[PDB]
Design a protein around this nucleic acid. Sequence first.
DNA 1: GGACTCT
DNA 2: AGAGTCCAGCCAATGACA
RNA 3: UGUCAUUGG
Lengths: 1250, 103, 95, 184
Amino acid sequence: AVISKVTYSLYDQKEINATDIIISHVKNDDDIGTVKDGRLGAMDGALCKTCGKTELECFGHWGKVSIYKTHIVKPEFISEIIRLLNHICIHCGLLRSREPYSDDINLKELSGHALRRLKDKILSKKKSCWNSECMQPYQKITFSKKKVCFVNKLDDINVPNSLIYQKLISIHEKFWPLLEIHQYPANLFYTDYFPIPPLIIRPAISFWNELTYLLGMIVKNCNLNADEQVIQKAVIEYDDIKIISNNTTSINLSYITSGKNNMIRSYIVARRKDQTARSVIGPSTSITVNEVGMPAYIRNTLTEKIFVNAFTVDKVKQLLASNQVKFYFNKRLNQLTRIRKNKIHLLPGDWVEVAVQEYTSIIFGRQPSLHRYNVIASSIRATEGDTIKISPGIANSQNADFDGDEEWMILEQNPKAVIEQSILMYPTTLLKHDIHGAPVYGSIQDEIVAAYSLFRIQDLCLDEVLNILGKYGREFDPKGKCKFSGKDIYTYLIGEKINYPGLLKDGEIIANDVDSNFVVAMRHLSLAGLLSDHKSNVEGINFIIKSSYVFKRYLSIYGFGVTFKDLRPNSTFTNKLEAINVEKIELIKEAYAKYLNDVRDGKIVPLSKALEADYVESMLSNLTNLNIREIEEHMRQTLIDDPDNNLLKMAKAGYKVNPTELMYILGTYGQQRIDGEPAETRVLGRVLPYYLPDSKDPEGRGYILNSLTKGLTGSQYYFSMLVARSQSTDIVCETSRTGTLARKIIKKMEDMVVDGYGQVVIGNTLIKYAANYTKILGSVCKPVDLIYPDESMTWYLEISALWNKIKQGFVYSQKQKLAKKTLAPFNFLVFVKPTTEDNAIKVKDLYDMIHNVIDDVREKYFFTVSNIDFMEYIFLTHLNPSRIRITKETAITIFEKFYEKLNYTLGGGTPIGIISAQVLSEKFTQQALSSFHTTEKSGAVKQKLGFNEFNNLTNLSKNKTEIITLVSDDISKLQSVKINFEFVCLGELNPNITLRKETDKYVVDIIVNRLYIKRAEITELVVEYMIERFISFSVIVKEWGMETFIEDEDNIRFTVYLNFVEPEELNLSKFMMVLPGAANKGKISKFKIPISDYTGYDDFNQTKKLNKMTVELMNLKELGSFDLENVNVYPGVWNTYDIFGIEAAREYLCEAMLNTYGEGFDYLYQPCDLLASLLCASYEPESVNKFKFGAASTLKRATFGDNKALLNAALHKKSEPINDNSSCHFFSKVPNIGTGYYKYFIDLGLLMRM
Amino acid sequence: IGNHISALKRRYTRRISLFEIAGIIAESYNLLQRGRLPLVSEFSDETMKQNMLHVIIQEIEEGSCPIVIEKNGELLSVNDFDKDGLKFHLDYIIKIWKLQKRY
Amino acid sequence: NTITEVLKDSEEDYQDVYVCENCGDIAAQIKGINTCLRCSKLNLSPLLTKIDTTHVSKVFLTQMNARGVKVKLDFERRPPSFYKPLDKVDLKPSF
Amino acid sequence: MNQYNVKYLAKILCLKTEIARDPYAVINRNVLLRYTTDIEYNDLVTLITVRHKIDSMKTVFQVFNESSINYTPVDDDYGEPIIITSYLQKGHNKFPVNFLYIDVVISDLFPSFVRLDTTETNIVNSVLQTGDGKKTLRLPKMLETEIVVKILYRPNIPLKIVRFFRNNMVTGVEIADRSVISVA
DNA sequence: GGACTCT
DNA sequence: AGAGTCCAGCCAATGACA
RNA sequence: UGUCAUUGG
Ligand SMILES: [Mg+2]
Ligand SMILES: [Zn+2]
Ligand SMILES: [Zn+2]
Ligand SMILES: [Zn+2]
C-alpha cells in the first residue's frame, strides 16, 4: 500500500509479444484489428471490449503489430548502441583487446579503477581487428541524421540493423561489467513485434489524435514487402523526431519530457485546482493581520466541507432541512451529488458541502511567490465589494501595493490540512522572519509619521489621550496625572517593564525619537520583536494590531499632508543654488580649458584619458557634494525656522526623504552614469549634435546642472531618459535569469532538513552538526554585540582564554574586517534588569551558574561534538559584573529561558534548506529588480557585486581566469610580480615613431617622453628590452641593431637599424603597423595592477599596514618563479580546491557568495554557508546545474530538468527509494518535510480494552 | 561512551516541537472527523454536544490519545514527550485557536 | 499534508486502481476478476496492489512505457511494530 | 624543485614534524611559531633542518626531484625521502609542484585540522547513528590525495576522519568532519 | 547569446 | 581548438485565426 | 486544441 522504491528497466521481447491484440490494418470499414481498436481501451462513447468499463474506469490495454523480418531500433537508445559499437568489431563480434578473453584475468573479482584501466586501452587501438580471421580496420559507425540508416564514415555505406543486432547479441554476459551493460542488448531493439500503446495516452480530441496518426503511419509500412528503413523512420518520428530532424512542435512521445512545458513540471508539481479564486486587492482597517476579507461572489461560489460523524450529524441534518447544502459526497458508494427532494442517508465518512463561513482558513497569496510569507493561511471575514481585502500590515510581507495587484485564494478543506493551516501557516506563527528574526508585519508609510508625531506630542488632556487610544482606552490607567504626553501613550501601548540597550528602560522609550526602525516590518529595532522576544508571537501580533489602530486614530484626529509650500515656499534657496551651480561649473570649465590650452601649446605633457576623466570626475563630484551640503544646511535651517514642516517630518521619521532626493528636486541632478562611466562618444567624437565635434564639455557627456524644480533641458532629459530606459532594459533582461537561478537553487537545497537530533542533513549525509550553530530556531536567535576582552572585566583571564579559542573567524574579508556582532542563542537582553550591588547575585556564583549551564548544555544537547564557546563568551561578557549586576532570579529566569529555547523551538523536519534558498533568491531578485548594485569602474580588477557574480559563483565554471589576490607586508615582493605581470605596450607610452630609408638600412627613431615612462612605473631599460625582444624574435626582420640616445631629460631616442626579410616593403609596412602593440611585456589584460594598501587585523587590539595586489590569472604556475614567501595568496575557487582542498573551497564559496549582496547583509551568512556546504558536500565542488556526485533520484533529476534521466535510469537498471519531494509528489506521497517528517500510527489497545 | 551518547540522544528524542504536536493533532482530528470513537473519560452524549478540538485536547492531556508517532527509531505517545513542552506548545495552539474562533 | 492534498487528485475522483508488482502496469477487470494481461499471457500470476496516485502520474508512466522504459514499483511489507512503554524523561535543568 | 619552492616545503615539514612527535595535535600556522628551519639548497638534494625551539630536537629532511633520487639516511633523518613530483601522486612524502607555487601554510585558506583518537571517533560514530536500527549518516568526503592527509599521515594509524576547525564569522570556530576516501 | 561535452 | 545540445521568472486577461 | 497580437501585477 506504501510504495517504497521504483525500478526502471527495459521491456524485453517476451513481454512485448505477451498480447492477444494483434494490430494489422490501417483503415477499415469496421475498426477491428486497427490502431483505434475498441479492446485497446474505452474510447469516447464506447465501453472497453477487454474489460467492459467506460472511459473513466478503463486504463487501457496494450496491442502489438508484427514487423516481419526487420529489427527496428529503439530510437532514444541509438547513441548507447553507437557507444556499444565503439567497443567491438562488426565482422567478428569480439572486443578490441585480447586481455578480456584470457584465462589469467578473472574479471569477476577485480574492484575499483582496475576495470577502467582496460577501457581506454580499448578506445586507443583503432587500426585493425586483432584476430587471425578478421584484420579489418576499426570502423566508426554513426547514425546519419540525413537519411535514417546507420552509416559507416570511412566510406558512406549503410550498415544494416540486423548485423548490429547479431554483433550486439554476440557479446557474452560476463563482459557486461566492462561495457556498462546491465541487461540483454536485444532489449535495445524490436526484433519481431512493436508495442501499440493504450488509448489513455491518446484520447479522442474534441473541439469545434497525433500519436494515433503516427502509429497509423507506423502500421502503414508494416508489411512483408517493406524495407526496415521506412519502418525505422516511422518509429523514430513517432517516438522522437529530433533524432533525424531539427523541428519542434511535433507532438511525439518526447513532448512529455521536452523542456519547461514537460509533464512533470506543468502537471505534477503544479496544477490547476478547484475551490480557487482570484481578485484585485484593497486595504482594510477592520481586518487585522490574522484575517482576510472575502468578496461576496467568492463566498457565494466557494464551498466548505462538513464531515458526517457523531458530532456534526445534527448540524448536517439541520442544513439539509433548510436547503443550505450544495453538494453531498457518499464515500461508501464513492460518488458526489450536486443538490439543485431526493433521498440522502448520512453515514460516517460521507460529507456535505455548504457555503463557506466566516473564520474558515483560506490559503491566499500573491504572485510571484518568492518566499514563504507570500502564501499564508488566515481567517475569512465577510467584506464588501469585489476585492479581496487584506490588511496593510501584511502588505510589505507580500511585496504588495494597492495599485492593481491581484491575489489568489484556495480552499483546502481536508482535516489534516485544516489543522496545518490553523497552526503552521497562521500569520501569528509567521511573525518573526526565519533567518534574521525581525518581524514580518508592521506599519507602512503614513503610520511611520503618525508614530513619530505621536511620540513627539505633549501636554494632552485625559480626553485627548482617550480619543487617540479609542477602543484600547478601556484599561488605560491615569495614575495621578492630569496632563499626559505621547511617551505615556507608548508606555501604555508596550505594557511590559522590559529593558533593551538604546531603546527601552522599564517600558519607557529612552530613544530620542520613534522612527521607521521601530514600527516598520523587517527592522532590527522593532518593538513588536522585543515584545515577542519577551513572551510570545501573540504579544507581538497584539502590539502590531493595537499600534496600527492607534496610529490610524492619530491620523484621523490630526491628519498628515505635505503641500507644495513645504518643499518650495519661495524662490530664494533655489535661486541661490542655481547661481552657485552656474558659477562653479564655469569655474570647472575654465580650469579644464586652461589645462587643455597648456597641453595644446605644449607647456605640459598630456595626461592619459583615464586620468583626465578621473580629474574631471573628481571636480564634478565635488560640485555634487557641495550641492548635498547646501541641501543639508537648508534642511537644518528650515527645521529650526519652521519646526512643523511635514516634508522634513517624514524625513526625520525615516520614510523615503533624504538629502539626495531633495538635491534632485531643489539642487542638481548630478552626473548620469551608464555602465559606470558617462555616455560613450559616437560619430564625430560627441554624443549629441548639440555640442561641437570632440567637445570637452562635461555637461555634454551627461552632467546635469538643472533640477526637477527648474526642469531639465533637452540634453539633460536625454541623459536622464538614457539612464531610465537602461535601468528598465536591465531589470527586464535580469528577471528571467534570477528566476532560473532561483529555481535551480531551490531544487538543489529543498531536500536539506533538520533531523531529529538537531543536525542539518540531506539524504544520508550530515551537512551540519548543529542547525543554526545553536540547535534553536533562527527566528529566536539574536545577533548581539560582540564585546572584545578588556582588562577591566571580571574574569578577564577566562574571557581572554575563550577569545583565544574562538578569535579566528572574527577577523575575515582578507583581514580587512573585524566582527562586531556575534550570535546570542536567544534575546536574553530583555530579561536583564539592573540591580544595586547589595541585592545582586554573588560574582563567583554567577560564574558557577554560567559555567555549569554551558557544560551541561555542551554535554546533553550538542553531544560533545560542537564548539559552543561563543555562547559562554556571550554570557560572560554581557552578564559581566563589571558593567551590569543582576539578581539571582534574573539569572535563573535567563537560563530557564535558555533551556526552554533549547528544548522547544527547533524541531526535526524543519525545511532549513528551502527556507535559506528562498531567502537568498528573494534577496538577489529584489536587488536585481531594484537596481541596488550600481556599476562603478576603477583602476584595479575588483570582485564584482550582484546577481551575475552570484551566478558565476554557483556556476563553478572551470576554464576561466580567476582574480588572485596577493597581500604582503613588504612591497618589494609585490613590486617584482607587478613589474612582470602588468601589461605595458609601446603604443600606450605615447611614442614618437618616425622611420626613413637609407642605403643598407631602414632606420626607425622612437622618441619617447620620460614622464610617460614614469607614469607607466617602468624604466627606460624596460622599454629598450620590450623593443629588443620584439625585434630579436620577430620573423619578418632579417637583421637589426639598436642604440639608445639621450635627447633631453624629457626625451629618450631608441634608434633601430633594420633590414627586413624579402619582400621588404610589405614586411616594412607590417612592421610599422604592428610595432606599437607587439613591443610589450606582461600578461595581456585590460586591468592594470596598482599596489593598494590597507590596515589589516591580527586581532582586535593589534593591526598592521598591508599591501594588496590583484591579478587576473588562469593557473597558478607562472607565480612559481617568484620569491612569494610571507605572502598571503587568495586564489579563486578551483585553485583553492586544487591546492588547499575541499574545506577551503567551501569557505571561499561561503564568503564570496556573501560578498555579492553588499554592505549590511551579514544575516545572509548562515544561508550562504548552507549553500556552500551543499556545493562542497562531496570531495569536489559541484555546481547547481548538474547532479554529479550527490545521490539524486531519477524523478528528482527529471523534475530539475534532464530529458534523458529516465532513459539513463532504464539503461543502467536503477532501483531507487522514494525519499525526496520530487519523488513524493509523483506518487502522491506525503513529503518528509515538517509534519510529514514523522510516521504516525494508531494504538488500538485502549479501544479494544473497552 | 557510545552507550552514553546513545542515552543522551534517547533523552534528546523526547523534545517536542510544533511540527510533531501539529501532526499528532491533525492525525487525531482527521480520524475523529471521519467517525472514530472519541476515547475520553466520561463518555456520554454530552461529549457529542461540544466541539471536536476540545475532545482532541482532552484526549491529549488525559493520556488516552491513540496516535503514536515514530521519531528517531522510537515509538512515542503524546505523553512520552516532555510535559512542559506539550504544555508550552498547547498553550500557544489554544491561544491562536481562540483567536480563530474555533476552540 | 496540505501540499499533499493540494497536489493530488480530488477525493471525489477516487477509484480502485490495481498495479502489477511484476511488470508495473495497471491490472484489468475482465468480468470481476483483477487480472494482468501481460502476465497471464506469460503464464504468471503475480501480486496486484491497490494504488492511489494521480491520473497524470499513470498517463506519464504509460507514456514512458510506450517509449520502452519499464517502470516497476515495489511496496513496503513492513514488519508489524508494537508500542512499548517508555521511562520518564524530564528535560528541565538542574540548579 | 627550485630555491623558492623549498621554503614552502620547509613550512610544510614543520607540520609533518609536529605530527611525527604527536599524532593528535592541532595543525595550523601557529605550529610554525614553535619551529625553526634551515635550508641547504642544491639541484640534486635539498637538506631541510627543522628544529623544535624548546626541546632542541632536530629533524633533517632530504628533498629530491622525482627523477633523481639518491637517498641514504643521514643522522636525525625523518626516515623517508621527500619527493617533489610533477603531478599529484599517492604518497605522504610525494608533494606535487602545484602545492608549492605559493606559500600555503601561512595562507588564510590553510585549514585547521586534527586526526581524531578512538574516543572522539567513537563519539562521532555514535552521533552519526540515526537511532533507527543499524542505519547511519555519512560525513562529507575528502580525497586521500590532499595536503591535509599528507601532513596527518602516520604509518600504523589509518586516517579515516579529519576534524576541521572552520572560521565562522558569527560563532568564531565551527567543528566539521570529513571522511577520507581511497584513491587508486 | 552562452556554458558543457565530444571530437 | 570547433560544432551539438539545451537553456532562457511566475501568474494572468482580451481578441483574431488555423 | 494550439499559435499570433496587445495588455496587466
Ligand atoms: Mg502593484
Ligand atoms: Zn479496458
Ligand atoms: Zn574482425
Ligand atoms: Zn503482470
